[PDB]
């Protein structure tokens, strides 16, 4: 078409990504359902913190999706030991993520694949949610759902307990895990299995009771663990202020309903406290 | 340089939809299906379905092409 | 959401005259291409409309007997796909029988109604060789249909707005004590609204409200107070008049709709097969 391919950007199980002219092109069933999901959802959304689908083109049963080219992602930022993630940088990343998520949720769509490598940063420091191949619309009681969504390290306890129906809590828990990774520069709960993930969650945060999570025992894959006391949040993050601890606690509530929404998190005093979020131009780059 | 929350102002071209946390107060939730304990444990409430239905009912009602 | 959707932005048109202009332009462009490539064979735009109505009804029947049970959202999305495709394409270039099946296939994909290709084509009353040929045609035309929809796949149906309006009536309009008995009739009118061009001319909320109030009028219930008082339109008199005229125009579209005649359908079908065989 009108795009000349400059560089090969990467290859996953889904498709391959190329830097083309700047845009990024992602290469009997027919057209791939993940690509159709991305197309249909991104054509109905328009926000500076959500990746924009510029154009789609293909041949036969193949298809190629054109997005804006994004310089890096949060995974590379976290894994880069040569840059310091100041509280202002963390606040800025958190704010852009939550604004994109607020727009996404008010249009009744869950990302369901939130992780540092799905949070892309452009040359202007503008964070955008990307990889909507697992995103789905929520709010329909008739709609069926799958509990095996979100990468395990960032998966919520309701998902790890087999919750079919869920709301924005899955994205909020992934957001809390991303914030914890930003603070610790390493994955928060790096389980090697679903049981190991749940065990690490209950070790770091405590085993939830009938009081912190009323109908938790009603989930299908629920398995009772030992009464882990849980490390206090101010000991895990020793360089976190009380406002940041409140934000973390809200993001990491075992009750998904009580877990703070994107709007409530944005209204949190942490985001209005000093210092303000770093301007996108001054955010660190690898 | 501090951040102040500003609500997202997107025109709906229709009647005002009551806020999510007010629906039960206003009697809407007595006309929707009650959420199950399984759905509640995962963070799903009947308030979400009722709010979505009301927003879609009121979306673009006053709009003309 | 509809209020910032692609359906509102690009696929809600000002008047039926614009729709007729689009269809006539498609017919003229196909005729020009056929003439340049190298007669009573060509169909007229009204004949194309008759065929499109017949094949939209065929798509309805296909989606109705589909197994496993197809959600009404998928059916609405597929029918809207059919309407949009043949707004800008001639039935003599792409056969409506294949295009409607491709619309159903794409709609099942888009609305996350997970169905495999073999069980999709098993619903056809065709031999297995014919089913495999139809599957090959559907896979060939899937990208074409997506391209002709301008990659606007999310379709806002009037069903959820209808449910929301019923909730609002049950909550805030005690004068209509039981809105539930208004459903079956308001659904029926809704289906009739689907057969016309209204889905390309009005919002899903307007369509749902018009169906509900047509059911109310058929029930002898005058609920203009719901518009003026409950929906707060007594403040904006012009808005109330505009909405009432929208509903009146929708009722006019429904009352003047003509179902395709069987004899004309058969004649135009022979003509269309002639067009596809000659080409
Ligand atoms: C919207 C989407 C299609 C997009 C837009 N830009 N972009 C880039 N640019 C470069 C880059 C380099 C490192 C980290 C993030 C980004 C890469 C990529 N995928 C690669 C990289 N990580 C593993 C592979 O999948 N996808 C995209």
């Amino acid at each position: 078409k009108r795009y000349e391919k400059l560089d090969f950007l990467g290859e996953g199980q889904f498709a391959t990504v190329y830097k083309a002219r700047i845009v990024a092109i992602k290469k009997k069933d027919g057209i791939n359902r993940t690509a159709l999901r991305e197309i249909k959802l991104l054509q109905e959304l328009s926000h500076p913190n959500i990746i924009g689908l510029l154009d789609a083109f293909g041949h036969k049963s193949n298809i190629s999706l054109v997005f804006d080219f994004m310089e890096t992602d949060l995974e590379v930022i976290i894994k880069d030991n040569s840059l310091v993630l100041t509280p202002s940088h963390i606040k800025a990343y958190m704010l852009m993520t939550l604004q994109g998520l607020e727009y996404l949720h008010q249009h009744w769509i869950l990302h369901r694949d939130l992780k540092p490598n799905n949070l892309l940063l452009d040359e202007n420091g503008v964070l955008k949610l990307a990889d909507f191949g697992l995103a789905k619309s929520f709010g329909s009681p008739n709609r069926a759902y799958t509990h095996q969504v979100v990468t395990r390290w960032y998966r919520a306890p309701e998902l790890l307990f087999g919750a079919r129906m869920y709301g924005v809590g899955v994205d909020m828990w992934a957001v809390g895990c991303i914030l914890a990774e930003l603070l610790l520069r390493v994955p928060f709960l790096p389980g090697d299995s679903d049981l190991d993930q749940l065990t690490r969650i209950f070790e770091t945060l405590g085993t939830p009771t009938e009081e912190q999570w009323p109908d938790m025992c009603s989930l299908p894959d629920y398995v009772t663990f030992k009464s882990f006391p849980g490390i206090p949040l101010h000991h895990i993050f020793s360089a976190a202020g009380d406002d940041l601890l409140d934000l973390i606690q809200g993001l990491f509530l075992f009750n998904p309903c009580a877990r703070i929404t994107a709007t409530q998190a944005l209204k949190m005093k942490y985001f209005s406290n000093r210092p303000g979020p770093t301007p996108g131009c001054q955010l660190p780059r690898p | 340089a501090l951040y102040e929350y500003q609500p997202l102002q997107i025109e709906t071209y229709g009647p005002h939809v009551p806020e999510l946390e007010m629906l039960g107060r206003l009697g809407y939730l007595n006309h929707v299906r009650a959420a199950s304990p399984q759905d509640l444990a995962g963070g799903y409430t009947s308030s979400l379905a009722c709010h979505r239905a009301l927003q879609d009912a009121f979306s673009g009602l006053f709009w003309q092409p | 959401m509809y209020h910032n959707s692609s359906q509102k932005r690009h696929w809600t048109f000002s008047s039926e005259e614009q729709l007729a202009r689009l269809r006539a332009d498609a017919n003229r462009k196909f005729r020009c291409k056929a003439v340049a490539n190298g007669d009573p064979v060509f169909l007229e735009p009204h004949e194309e409309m008759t065929l499109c109505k017949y094949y939209e009804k065929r798509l309805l029947e296909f989606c109705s007997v589909f197994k496993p049970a197809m959600p009404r959202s998928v059916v609405g999305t597929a029918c809207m796909y059919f309407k949009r495709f043949y707004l800008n394409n001639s039935v003599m270039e792409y056969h409506p029988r294949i295009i409607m099946l491709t619309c159903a296939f794409l709609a099942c994909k888009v609305d996350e109604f997970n169905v495999s290709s073999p069980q999709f084509v098993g619903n056809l009353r065709e031999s297995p060789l014919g089913q495999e040929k139809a599957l090959e045609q559907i896979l060939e035309y899937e990208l074409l249909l997506i391209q002709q929809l301008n990659f606007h796949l999310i379709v806002h149906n009037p069903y959820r707005p209808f449910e929301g309006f019923l909730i609002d009536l049950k909550t805030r309009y005690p004068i209509l004590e039981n809105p539930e008995i208004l459903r079956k009739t308001a659904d029926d009118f809704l289906n009739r609204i689907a057969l016309t061009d209204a889905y390309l001319l009005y919002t899903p909320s307007q369509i749902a409200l018009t169906a509900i109030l047509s059911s109310a009028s058929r029930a002898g219930i005058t609920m203009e107070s719901y518009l003026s008082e409950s929906l707060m339109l007594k403040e904006n008199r012009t808005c109330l008049s505009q909405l009432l005229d929208i509903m009146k125009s929708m009722r006019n579209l429904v009352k003047k709709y003509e179902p395709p005649r069987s004899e004309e359908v058969a004649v135009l079908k022979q003509k269309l097969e002639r067009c596809h065989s000659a080409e």
Side-chain angles (χ1 to χ4, degrees):
Chain A
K1 217 207 174 170
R2 37 146 162 185
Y3 310 103
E4 52 143 332
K5 298 197 322 143
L6 296 172
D7 183 85
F8 172 78
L9 277 193
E11 161 178 359
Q13 73 101 344
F14 291 104
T16 62
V17 186
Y18 321 71
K19 178 183 176 182
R21 176 48 169 77
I22 293 306
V23 308
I25 306 202
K26 184 188 313 186
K27 197 94 154 263
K28 88 177 174 285
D29 187 57
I31 295 203
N32 192 274
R33 270 185 187 73
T34 287
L36 280 195
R37 190 168 297 115
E38 278 220 281
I39 291 166
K40 80 193 176 217
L41 295 175
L42 293 187
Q43 289 284 74
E44 300 318 306
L45 303 161
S46 175
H47 189 275
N49 302 117
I50 299 189
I51 195 80
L53 179 67
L54 271 55
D55 166 46
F57 66 96
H59 58 101
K60 321 170 311 177
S61 288
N62 208 16
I63 208 155
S64 300
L65 309 187
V66 181
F67 314 84
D68 303 281
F69 171 71
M70 303 283 302
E71 181 152 71
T72 182
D73 53 6
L74 259 197
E75 155 153 63
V76 175
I77 305 293
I78 289 157
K79 294 178 138 111
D80 200 304
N81 75 296
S82 94
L83 50 89
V84 201
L85 286 195
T86 71
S88 286
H89 299 340
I90 283 150
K91 192 184 290 197
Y93 292 132
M94 273 339 273
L95 174 65
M96 275 158 325
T97 306
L98 286 177
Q99 280 165 319
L101 220 50
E102 177 189 43
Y103 178 113
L104 203 54
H105 291 333
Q106 66 165 81
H107 294 93
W108 297 92
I109 294 151
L110 299 183
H111 190 289
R112 305 200 304 172
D113 218 38
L114 282 177
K115 51 186 133 178
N117 69 64
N118 278 350
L119 308 189
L120 314 189
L121 272 292
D122 74 339
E123 73 272 356
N124 306 317
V126 174
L127 186 146
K128 308 200 193 270
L129 317 189
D131 207 303
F132 282 74
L134 271 310
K136 209 199 215 306
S137 85
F138 74 105
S140 299
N142 51 259
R143 191 44 70 79
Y145 262 88
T146 280
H147 73 289
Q148 203 89 32
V149 298
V150 189
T151 295
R152 163 171 304 125
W153 287 1
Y154 313 86
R155 195 169 312 147
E158 64 264 29
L159 294 177
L160 291 156
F161 284 138
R164 319 273 110 91
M165 299 294 344
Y166 46 82
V168 312
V170 299
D171 281 10
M172 304 326 301
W173 184 281
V175 153
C177 294
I178 288 153
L179 171 57
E181 205 164 331
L182 287 170
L183 289 170
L184 308 160
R185 301 312 301 274
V186 285
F188 190 39
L189 311 144
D192 45 56
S193 73
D194 286 0
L195 300 316
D196 188 44
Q197 191 69 26
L198 280 158
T199 325
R200 291 177 112 107
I201 285 167
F202 294 170
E203 268 156 62
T204 300
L205 296 167
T207 303
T209 88
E210 205 176 10
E211 302 86 73
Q212 322 190 25
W213 193 345
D215 269 329
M216 155 196 49
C217 306
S218 206
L219 293 176
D221 308 337
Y222 173 71
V223 282
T224 89
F225 288 80
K226 273 68 55 205
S227 173
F228 296 90
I231 294 103
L233 284 171
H234 82 268
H235 289 129
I236 297 142
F237 320 95
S238 60
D242 273 329
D243 54 0
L244 181 46
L245 293 182
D246 284 318
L247 172 66
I248 288 171
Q249 173 194 281
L251 290 170
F252 274 122
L253 289 174
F254 294 107
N255 200 349
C257 303
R259 192 173 309 144
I260 58 179
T261 70
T263 295
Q264 296 170 338
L266 288 172
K267 291 174 176 170
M268 224 85 182
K269 177 47 55 93
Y270 162 78
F271 287 109
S272 38
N273 282 122
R274 281 171 28 84
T278 289
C281 52
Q282 288 201 354
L283 279 177
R285 326 262 269 273
Chain B
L2 298 196
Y3 162 84
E4 321 148 37
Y5 176 79
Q6 294 300 300
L8 270 206
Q9 314 297 7
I10 307 177
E11 181 74 44
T12 78
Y13 304 102
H16 180 264
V17 48
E19 268 322 339
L20 167 59
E21 65 275 344
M22 292 306 258
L23 304 182
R25 267 55 43 200
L26 297 154
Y28 290 95
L29 294 190
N30 329 106
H31 309 116
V32 305
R33 157 199 90 79
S36 272
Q38 171 120 342
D39 293 7
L40 263 171
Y44 190 77
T45 55
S46 55
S47 288
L48 292 181
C50 184
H51 206 225
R52 214 211 184 308
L54 292 172
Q55 294 186 60
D56 280 342
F58 295 165
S59 196
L61 187 62
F62 305 151
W63 189 78
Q64 263 219 342
Chain C
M1 302 297 308
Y2 175 77
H3 56 258
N4 57 354
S5 69
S6 59
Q7 167 168 326
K8 154 183 172 282
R9 174 173 331 111
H10 298 291
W11 298 95
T12 320
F13 299 89
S14 38
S15 42
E16 277 217 323
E17 288 74 34
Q18 210 183 321
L19 301 193
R21 152 131 56 82
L22 298 167
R23 292 158 166 139
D25 181 30
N27 189 261
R28 191 170 35 247
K29 242 179 264 200
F30 177 84
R31 280 172 185 235
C32 154
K33 252 176 273 155
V35 156
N37 245 329
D39 327 68
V41 67
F42 283 139
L43 287 166
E44 306 296 337
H46 73 275
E47 304 173 309
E48 278 206 47
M49 267 301 308
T50 301
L51 279 175
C52 279
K53 292 193 234 161
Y54 165 76
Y55 277 94
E56 178 169 333
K57 166 171 324 322
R58 293 324 268 125
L59 176 56
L60 267 295
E61 250 162 62
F62 175 82
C63 289
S64 114
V65 293
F66 196 92
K67 328 189 218 82
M70 194 186 273
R72 229 161 79 148
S73 149
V74 169
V75 186
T77 304
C79 302
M80 162 74 70
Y81 284 168
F82 189 75
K83 292 182 190 288
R84 292 185 189 185
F85 180 82
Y86 279 124
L87 267 184
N88 297 307
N89 292 285
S90 170
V91 304
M92 290 169 339
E93 185 161 8
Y94 308 107
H95 205 283
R97 176 186 53 247
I98 310 164
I99 289 300
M100 66 167 209
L101 298 173
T102 302
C103 287
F105 189 77
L106 175 65
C108 284
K109 282 208 197 156
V110 158
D111 310 328
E112 310 274 354
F113 177 57
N114 285 359
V115 157
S116 77
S117 296
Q119 63 198 78
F120 180 83
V121 289
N123 276 286
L124 300 147
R125 298 173 201 255
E126 308 239 359
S127 74
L129 204 146
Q131 291 170 359
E132 211 83 304
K133 177 81 230 83
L135 191 270
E136 288 306 321
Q137 305 180 282
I138 288 165
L139 305 189
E140 187 35 52
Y141 275 176
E142 205 191 353
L143 179 58
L144 155 80
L145 167 64
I146 293 178
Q147 255 155 356
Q148 285 316 299
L149 299 164
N150 230 298
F151 299 90
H152 301 143
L153 289 328
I154 293 291
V155 168
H156 298 280
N157 305 296
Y159 311 126
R160 190 164 308 124
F162 176 86
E163 297 294 334
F165 271 125
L166 270 197
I167 290 166
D168 197 34
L169 283 174
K170 289 164 164 180
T171 310
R172 285 198 316 172
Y173 199 67
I175 293 102
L176 177 73
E177 273 221 6
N178 185 289
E180 258 321 284
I181 40 82
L182 279 200
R183 174 181 288 267
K184 183 74 225 75
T185 306
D187 179 280
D188 286 334
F189 202 83
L190 208 52
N191 291 338
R192 312 172 55 207
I193 300 186
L195 297 187
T196 78
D197 283 285
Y199 283 18
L200 310 164
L201 301 160
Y202 307 110
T203 78
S205 44
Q206 286 156 13
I207 291 150
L209 186 53
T210 313
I212 290 187
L213 291 213
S214 301
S215 187
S217 307
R218 209 154 297 107
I221 308 172
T222 68
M223 41 200 273
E224 48 90 19
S225 157
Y226 177 65
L227 290 324
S228 64
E229 319 196 319
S230 307
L231 311 188
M232 210 81 234
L233 282 189
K234 66 102 208 166
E235 179 94 13
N236 226 301
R237 29 190 168 287
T238 44
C239 194
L240 171 43
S241 84
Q242 171 173 219
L243 194 279
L244 281 176
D245 274 79
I246 278 163
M247 308 222 313
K248 169 119 195 311
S249 284
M250 195 169 300
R251 295 192 307 266
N252 296 329
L253 284 183
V254 173
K255 72 172 51 74
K256 78 175 175 74
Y257 169 86
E258 265 319 300
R261 263 118 51 218
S262 194
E263 312 99 16
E264 203 185 326
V265 152
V267 165
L268 303 179
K269 274 186 76 178
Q270 306 258 42
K271 212 166 154 195
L272 181 63
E273 319 284 284
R274 270 210 336 270
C275 298
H276 281 283
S277 62
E279 171 77 10

